[PDB]
Amino acid sequence: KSHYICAGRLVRILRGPRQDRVGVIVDIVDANRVLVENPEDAKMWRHVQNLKNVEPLKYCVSVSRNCSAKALKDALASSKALEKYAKTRTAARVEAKKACAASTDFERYQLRVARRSRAHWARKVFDEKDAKTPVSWHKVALKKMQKKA
Amino acid sequence: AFPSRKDASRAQRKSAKKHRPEIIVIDLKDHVLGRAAAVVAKQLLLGKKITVVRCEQLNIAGTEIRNKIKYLQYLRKRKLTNPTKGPFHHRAPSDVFVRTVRSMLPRYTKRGMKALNSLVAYEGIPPNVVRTGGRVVIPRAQRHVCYRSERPYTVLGNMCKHVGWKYSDVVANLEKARVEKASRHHEKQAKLREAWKAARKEALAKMPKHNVEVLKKFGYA
Amino acid sequence: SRKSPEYTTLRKSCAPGVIAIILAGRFRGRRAVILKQLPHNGPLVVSGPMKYNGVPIRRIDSRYVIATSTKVDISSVDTAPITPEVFVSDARAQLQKKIDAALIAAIKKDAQGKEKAGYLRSVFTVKPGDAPHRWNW
Amino acid sequence: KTSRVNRNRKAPRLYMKGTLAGYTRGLHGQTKQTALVRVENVNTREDATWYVGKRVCYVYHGKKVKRCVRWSKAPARRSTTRALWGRVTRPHGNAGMMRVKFNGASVPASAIGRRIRVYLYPSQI
RNA sequence: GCCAGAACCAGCCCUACUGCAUUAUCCUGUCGGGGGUCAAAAUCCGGCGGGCAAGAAGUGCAAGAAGGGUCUUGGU
RNA sequence: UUAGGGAUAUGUGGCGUCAAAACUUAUGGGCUCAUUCUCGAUACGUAAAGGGUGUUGGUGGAUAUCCACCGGCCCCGAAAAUGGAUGACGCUUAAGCCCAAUUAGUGAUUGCCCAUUAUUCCUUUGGUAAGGGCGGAAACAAAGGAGAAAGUGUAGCCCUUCCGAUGU
RNA sequence: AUCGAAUCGCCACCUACAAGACUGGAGCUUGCUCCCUCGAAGGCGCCAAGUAUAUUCAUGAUCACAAGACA
Ligand SMILES: NC[C@@H]1O[C@H](O[C@H]2[C@@H](O)[C@H](O[C@@H]3[C@@H](O)[C@H](N)C[C@H](N)[C@H]3O[C@H]3O[C@H](CO)[C@@H](O)[C@H](O)[C@H]3N)O[C@@H]2CO)[C@H](N)[C@@H](O)[C@@H]1O
Ligand SMILES: [Mg+2]
Ligand SMILES: [Mg+2]
């Protein structure tokens, strides 16, 4: 279910000069702009974001409208909203591109030998479970063959 | 066009593997008629081979009565001296889309005729197109991002059945029979789709752990 | 100083020890290690080593090489002048193996040095969906 | 009998696939002096500045086997295949197209819409 | 006296790296009078106490002696 | 505003396809729905009076509701003789109208596309053209080379420099 | 059988289907709280059949259509 724009609602910036940074709505200007501040991040000082560039998250600190910029740092510390976000899967996809957009050619090789490992293991586990149950196409056709040939 | 015996003996003298060219297949369900036609008219002219599918599901903005009158104003045009030499008024949704692409091409040169014969434009999904790869989509033309949802729209298969196009019900029984068939195929292999993903979660901890915290740095766990 | 043989104008990324990508020539897409640069602003000289990817001691220039961040820190023998490469001879077959085995000696004493020996056997190709203009190397 | 994938251990490609879009032109007609190449996955003007200076090839064939390079040294590359060469000179627009010029001539107009390979050499990194 | 590639000079064309001034109808501090609220923080107005909002401003001027072009010139 | 050619940058006009450019840009704001010559849309350039409880703003009165006015877009007013035209397709989270930006409350410059224009680099040609050199400096065989004319005009005496160039 | 050619991503995991005023599941204070599958990846492929002291590669000599091309 969609998450409403309210004072305290954590938004992630979509495609500004920030592109991935989370921020807390501290005031709503009108039908298309809010004030966004995250004291934990350096680039996230109290600025004005258009609501076409925000993405509301499921987390919402209990803070009031037009906060005092020091009770905001108190509000997201007691709520632990930044740490609950930091273990979601969508936040892991944000920090994963930051490795891909900073990877050297050697650690792109390490990702390729990691994926070819897991792929080699998942296809030999799939081998030694398809001998027991005839699931795959090689094993359905041979099971419906040896029973009458 | 079936291949002739000169084109069949050379595929036996030379042992020709079965070849398929690089063909991009667009699923045009819920697309803007002229925004999809302009994306296609540029890609065909950049040398893309494009099969277009499900043309009875294209949308045109406005009331169905509005877009049906604009076709009937188009059908009002004919060469009065000899209408066999006139504008030819195609009623199929698959042929409305070929025209709308063609009117965005340089139609009267050879480069714009090599690009309009690169487009195929079926309606429904025919049996040769079904199992040839995942269909693609044009996300800048998809009616849920391009039309304001309070405004009416017009399905092209419904505008065209009331101006001609006597094969509306044939397409509706060929696509009812497909989605019944393709959903029987998809309840099948659900113990093959779950077989791999319970083997790709089991491949972890059967693989060395120094290749897993590099597989968790890039988020591929 | 420009007429001196130690005058180079070569990039700071194409240092000795820097693992390269060949991009052209016979052994394109392979990963060879940059040994040194020939005098009078000469071309680079890369060995593979041949034990790993099949690239011998050969001349290549800087503009046909992507130099990456990964070094192996060679301090090996440099007795490859501008004249073993002049008009396999048993000299070049001996000069190969004497520098070949000095590479694997220096590959393995590197930290994460077995990961780099496998890195020299892989092949760089351009996949149908990847962007080499947005990559760090 | 087991699940063995296909692996693509062919010869590598060290080029980027592009398309000859056409030429520089206005409303008034073409300037065949310089050509326009849309390269795949290059879509921003910053992404075309990386490729400025790279070498560019249009591979085609003729009808007869005319004389290529290494005709005497390597008689296995003797082919009906020809090639025209060029350089990316500058970006063209915001959308990541390049403005290339071929060596000493222009690209044939038959090449419009056909495959052009742009390379990674001359290297800068 | 043919075709390519790189190198290095010079010239010319690109783009990186920024300083000097200016803030005040402004910043901050508390007591009011005002607001709304479950209570109250804010918007708002006013006292005199301090001030530097400091890659701080999209405000005035900028002189910061390169990395890339040159099948965009000549040369070795 | 125009010698024969390149490179860069513009102008008028543009950037959904035709058709180069916003691979349909913004991390800008509003307004607009129109059902048989089919809303609208590049000036010059070839429908009015009047009307609307369509929508969107304003102004002045009165007791959450009424009253008088004024504006924007849209509709009505609006009927012709080959089939027909915002140039065509189309567009309606505009690709329309009015404002505004330039990669976006991030930290200051110029988003980019097109000329017989501009700047600059070559070559030609002509000047109310402007300067220099022209007393062979020495020296040099074959088995470093040739030229050097006191000149309107040449295959121009030879160099350097500057400006102009279309036309019945 | 002329024929040398241009093309360079494979899959019996995509190759089913709707939806965007929603589309993981529920609560009731209907905009917030709560649950795990955490709601932003179709898998592979990119040179040992798989991350481990394993064994060919030159002389095709410094770019040239990749001189390869059954994945
Ligand atoms: N149009 C007639 C044809 O012209 C042909 O030549 C045509 C082209 O092939 C030719 O292009 C050549 C090209 O072959 C070769 N690869 C390089 C050469 N530099 C090009 O020539 C071009 O550049 C130079 C610049 O001064 C000029 O000599 C030439 O006029 C110009 N066309 O120039 C002509 C383009 O109009 C052949 N002579 C012949 O097929 C026939 O005569
Ligand atoms: Mg005039
Ligand atoms: Mg006359």
Residues with Cβ < 8 Å from B114, sequence gap 6 or more? D113
Tell me, in angstroms, the distance from the centre of ligand 3 to residue B58's CA.
65
Nearest-CA residue for ligand 1 atom 26 is D104
Cα separation, A123 vs A130, whole angstroms: 10
Please, which chains are in contact with C (at least 3 CB pairs closer than 8 A)?
A, D
- Beta strand B49-53 with B23-27 is parallel
For chain C, how far is it from start to end, CA to CA, in angstroms?
Answer: 32
CB contact under 8 A, B47 and D19: yes
3-state SS track over chain C: CCCCCCCCCCCCCCCCCEEEECCCCCCCCCCCEEEEECCCCCCEEEECCCCCCCCCCEEECHHHCEEEEEECCCCCCCCCCCCCCCCCCHHHHHHHHHHHHHHHHHHHCCCCHHHHHHHCCCCCCCCCCCCHHHCCC
Q: Say which DSSP state B203 is in.
A: S
- SS3 for A112? helix
Going by C-alpha positions, the residue among C16, D51, C124, D15 that lies closest to residue A104 is C124
Going by C-alpha positions, the residue among A100, A85, C119, A122 that lies closest to residue B219 is A100
Residues of D in contact with A138 (CB under 8 A): 1-3
What is the number of other CB atoms lying within 10 angstroms of the CB of residue C99?
Answer: 21
| Strand F closer than 7 A to residue B114 Cβ | no
CB contact under 8 A, B47 and D114: yes
Cis, peptide link before residue C5, omega less than 30° from 0: no
Distances in Å between the alpha carbon of B43 and those of B95, B119, D63? Answer: 19, 10, 29
To which residue do tokens 């193996």 refer? C97
- SS3 for B124? coil
Between CA D12 and C1' G68 the distance (Å) reads: 9
**Helix, strand, coil percent values for chain A (each to nearest 5):** 40, 20, 40
Number of the ligand 1 atom closest to the C-alpha atom of D104: 19
Interface test with D, best of A115, A127, A140, A142 (most D CBs within 10 A): A127
Burial annotation B12-24 (CB, 10 A radius, 16+ → b, else e): eeeeeeeeeeeee
What is the number of other CB atoms lying within 10 angstroms of the CB of residue B6?
Answer: 7
Burial annotation A67-83 (CB, 10 A radius, 16+ → b, else e): beeeebeebbeebebbe
Q: In terms of residues, how long is chain B?
A: 221
Nearest to D12 among C124, C128, C131 (CB): C124
CA distance D32 to chain B (A): 17
Q: What are phi and psi of D87, to 5 degrees?
A: -135, 140
Ligand 1 pocket member D105 (CB < 6 A)? yes
Name the nt closest to C42 by C-alpha to C1': E7
Between CA B42 and C1' F8 the distance (Å) reads: 30
Using the Cβ of C69 and the Cβ atoms of chain A, whether some distance falls under 8 Å is answered with yes
**Could you tell me the two tokens for D99?**
């403005």
Going by C-alpha positions, the residue among A97, A96, A95, A2 that lies closest to residue A55 is A2
Number of C-alpha atoms within 13 angstroms, CB side, residue B74? 16
